[PDB]
Assembly symmetry: D2
Homo-oligomer: 283 residues x 4
């Protein structure tokens, strides 16, 4: 599988979206799993999930790696509401356009917020819910905020450079030997290709600060079986939020990887794939 | 499989053990997994693990459910040293007697302490290490100690009764509907059958308080791949010790079950079996 | 000062209170500090605060030790709403009746909930806010709930006895040598004297469970300078809620006493008095 | 009081110190309080404590603001052992030279480590112990390490510049409006004046990593009454270590300031002075 061979586009129409272009990468043909990426500069579906798509397809799933609005090859957008909710509306728009009745959701960071909002707003349209360090869930009981990683994410948005990108990735990943030229070049290309996305994210962040993303109070509504993952060494979203989710969602479990930053599905891809495939099959 | 058809005895000889009788339940014939029980009145291998033995044997493992010294059908003993270490010596004695070169260890509560001590003392004799709420790892950062459950464990040891047993099990288990007459009757029989074990545990506890079991300082020595499990709702061993292990053991992961007391392998048997079998196969 | 010489009664009239009798103990004549007690069987103003009233009066404050509705010598009541809010309405009723424009509030456990609700509902009527282990603030990130102490509080409410009272106090206090016959006899007298209060608390708890007391979402509204106290060894309200308050209230500080249960103002009276008087004088 | 009018030097002789020059600032003449600074580039006694010296002297204490070896105007040194212990030896050397039998100790960050080591090694030479975010106490249960602030401290040591200094101070302090030109210029002067100190700290850090400073296992030996302070927003030493100390030292209390970085005695000077003076007077 390659980004090119799996690349697709679909126009969506959903509350506040009109003929809005969504890019996604699709492979496989069984039960649908939609994977939702984080909010870092240059993020997108393929970039975030290319170590996961193959094994999930091998296990018999139809995998859709979705580009959220204002990311990668999806249309540019300025959001005046919290991104989790607006992103979730876009997932519903995609599913309606593709005639997908229910999807399992996998979401990291901003994508975790997207998945939580989708589960809240459209409970009859979700299967299982998989969350990797979801962002925007209010204060930490231990971590000063904004977190170290978030400071770097904003610096990279406001002053993009290859060096600042490298700096960000060094904090993003636990194992520094994972930061290859290929990784750097790929994220840099996506940043260089879509400068308007960077500008628009910043405008959106001023309109709807991170506090507006906090759906903690509604977590008791979630009936989906939920699998929460965290990197022990995540400098972007606080580990104690894994406990917050575990205590507030009815049917959840929490899996924390040692020696793992803010990109668990990539840093610990083999274990992540096995655990999540097992969860989707058997839970 | 039944307790009767799997029941075996072996005399061990190891530092401080001379012709000492160890009872165990064995099934299967592949790689050896030794499962080690907690320190509650009436505990034993079969009692603690009967929801796990079958699936592990089905997966191709040789499973040994070991009765630790001073429990169930193993010989009575008064220990002047911390139980984790003395128990670990008994595991080594068993393996030597049965010509087992290396074993994967699974241990809950006191059994987790046993497994940690074994990994520390005999690193060339362990495969993988699976820990379910290990006991004796020093103070909690959040929980007043002794924990609620430990108070009840001591009350049951000093004044055994069916009612106190029921009280203990209500705190031990999250889901009260799991407390059947069968469970109560089985633990009660083991308590009634071996009064000397109760008396001896109490004498041992005075000689070597829980503080003596704390091997925290040596956790960096552990090279075994480690899978740590905790019940979110464990009132016997504090959840933050799961983090202590995760931060201090080189290669660990932490899995926490929601709606789960101090007996995770039984309360969440299906998920526990799948996760741990996957870990032994693939990690 | 004695309970008898300071005892006073006042009828209040405030939303849902009509000619409702409130008992309080008053001493001193400077700035008013209203101290609000917890929800344990037999609790009341004098009982909870008799180690604090003298030093506060000596420091120049007018101290009012208030009996909340459905406690001690205040009128009996069944509440269909969360007690923090209803109690706060009663504090406002008291202050209006006594022509008190603004009061500093000190509240432990249920009294902490009362004080938080009062600060939220009547921000122009509060000076400073002092909180000792406030109850009802949602789930803990670490403690299984209901907490050990809360189980005992309900057992004592439903089946009051001197022995169960003693059991409760042993968990309530860290230092067992503080549990004198005088303490036991005093709480027992208050329990024996007002059986209707016990029955009514239980009815109220069914109508408005602890979840309804959770005002976490509104903590950002609090503009009062706030001093939060916790017992390190509090088995009734979880220590991590001290952090929750510290992170969510604009201007707060947190002081945790070692070797201290759920009654910090009594167990560590000298240090508590010095700290809180200093806070009221200088913060 | 000024740095100039209080400046003094004394040669010390103590295990591994021979005719070693220690600079300190002294004022007042009552009971001795020795204040011990952190390990940041350009740190020293006066710099760290100039908002505290006056009020403590006013309260009747003799205050000694000590420059630790390899800082400010004390002699240069390369340490092959953990700095807490070596620093503590230097405090003993100072006290012996000045005929001080017992001192109260106040220590932030590295200075907190110094104070803990002194209490451990010389228990008959300490009065009370005051700790502000002591460094080197092993892993955090929540914070990825090295902490954000520590990364910046090392960057400033290895590549000193005014800009990197400003960057460091922005993370060091919660309230950005506290970062005046005066503060920046003062720390910069101390960095420019003693380049050898920067080089030597780095050499020392390679010889004795932060893990070697961890005296956690010995905290039970401390008999001094202890007051622990933390900034809620400390990005240099993890808040949960405040709990570690509170649970492990016999007689401790913990005070956490909101809106406070890694320099609590300066950021919240008025409250810090009142609390600590009260503690020394009355505890
Ligand atoms: O995976 C990526 O897209 C990425 O590189 C990052 Cl740094 C994602 C961060 C968040 O989405 C985030 C959002 C809100 C709060 C915290 C983190
Ligand atoms: O599984 C059992 O055997 C059992 O019923 C219990 Cl209550 C085990 C508790 C501990 O082993 C334990 C030991 C030290 C500290 C905390 C718990
Ligand atoms: O001080 C007392 O009145 C007393 O003895 C107790 Cl046990 C108070 C407990 C609570 O108010 C409480 C309320 C809600 C949640 C947790 C504790
Ligand atoms: O107050 C200062 O001297 C200063 O500016 C800093 Cl940044 C001190 C940091 C530590 O001493 C430290 C040492 C070990 C671990 C963590 C922090
Ligand atoms: Na490489
Ligand atoms: Na049933
Ligand atoms: Na006594
Ligand atoms: Na200014």
């Amino acid at each position: 599988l390659t980004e090119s061979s799996t690349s697709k586009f679909v126009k969506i129409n959903e509350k506040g979206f009109s003929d809005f272009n969504i890019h996604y990468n699709e492979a496989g043909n069984g039960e649908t799993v939609i994977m939702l990426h984080g909010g870092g500069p240059g993020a997108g579906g393929w970039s975030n999930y290319y170590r996961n798509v193959g094994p999930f397809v091998d296990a018999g799933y139809r995998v859709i790696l979705k580009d959220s609005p204002g990311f990668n090859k999806s249309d540019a957008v300025v959001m005046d509401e919290q991104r989790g909710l607006v992103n979730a509306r876009a997932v519903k728009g995609l599913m309606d356009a593709l005639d997908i009745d229910r999807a399992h959701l996998v979401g990291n960071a901003m994508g975790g917020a997207t998945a939580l909002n989708f589960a809240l707003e459209y409970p009859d349209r979700i299967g299982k819910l998989i969350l990797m360090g979801p962002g925007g869930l209010g204060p930490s009981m231990f971590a000063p905020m904004p977190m170290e990683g978030i400071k770097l994410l904003f610096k990279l948005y406001a002053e993009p450079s290859y060096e600042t990108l490298k700096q960000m990735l060094q904090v993003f990943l636990y194992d520094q030997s994972l930061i290859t030229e290929e990784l750097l070049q790929g994220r840099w290309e996506a940043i260089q290709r879509q400068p308007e996305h960077l500008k628009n994210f910043l405008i959106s962040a001023q309109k709807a600060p991170l506090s507006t993303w906090d759906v903690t109070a509604r977590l008791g509504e979630i009936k989906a079986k939920t699998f929460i993952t965290w990197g022990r060494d995540d400098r972007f979203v606080p580990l104690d939020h894994g406990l917050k989710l575990l205590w507030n969602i009815d049917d959840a479990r929490l899996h924390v990887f040692s020696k793992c930053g803010h990109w668990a599905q990539w840093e610990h891809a083999d274990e992540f794939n096995r655990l999540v495939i097992d969860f989707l099959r058997h839970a």
